[PDB]
Amino acid sequence: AEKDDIKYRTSIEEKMTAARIRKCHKCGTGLIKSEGANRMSCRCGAQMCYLCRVSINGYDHFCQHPRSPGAPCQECSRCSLWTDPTEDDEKLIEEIQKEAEEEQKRKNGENFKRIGPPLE
C-alpha cells in the first residue's frame, strides 16, 4: 500500500533527475554543464554532446556553419554548439512533475501530492 506510493514517487523523482543529469558512457558519472558549449569533456576524458547525449570525437558533431542571427542553419540539421537546453529541460521536468502530482491526487484522494522540489 504505502510501498506503492513510495515506488511511484521515487520513480517520478528519478525521471526528473534523469531529464537534467548527463551520464558519461566511459566512467558512468553524472554531469551537468555550468556554462560554455554543448561539447562536454568528462573528467575521465570521454567527450559527449550535451544535447543528444551521444559520444563524440570533437566539434565536427555540431553545426559549424555561419548562421543568420535568430535563424536555423540552412546547410545542416546538426546539434547547435551554443544553445542552452536549460529552459526546455526545466519545462520537461515541470510537466512530468505536474502530471505525476495529478496522478497521485487521482490515486490517493483530493486531500500530500507534491513530488520533488517546489516552483518559484
Binding site: T17, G28, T29, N38, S41, C42, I93, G116, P118
Partner: protein, 76 residues
Amino acid sequence: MQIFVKTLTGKTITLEVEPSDTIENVKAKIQDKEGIPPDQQRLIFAGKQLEDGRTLSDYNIQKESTLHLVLRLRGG
C-alpha cells in the same frame, strides 16, 4: 528518514538523515561514509541542485529519496 546517495562512480550508499538537516550536514555524512570532501560534492535531487545553507525539507526530499553526486563542468 533513510535516503540513498548515488556517487560519482555509480555506487549507491544509504544515509540516515532528518529532513531538517542542512545540505552541509548531508555532505559531511557523505564524507564520513565515502571519503568525499564536501567542497567537491554537488547534489542533485529531482533535477534541482541543492545549495548550501538549505535543508532537505526545502526540496521536499522524503524517505527513500535519492540524491545524486554530479560533476559540474565547463563546455568547450
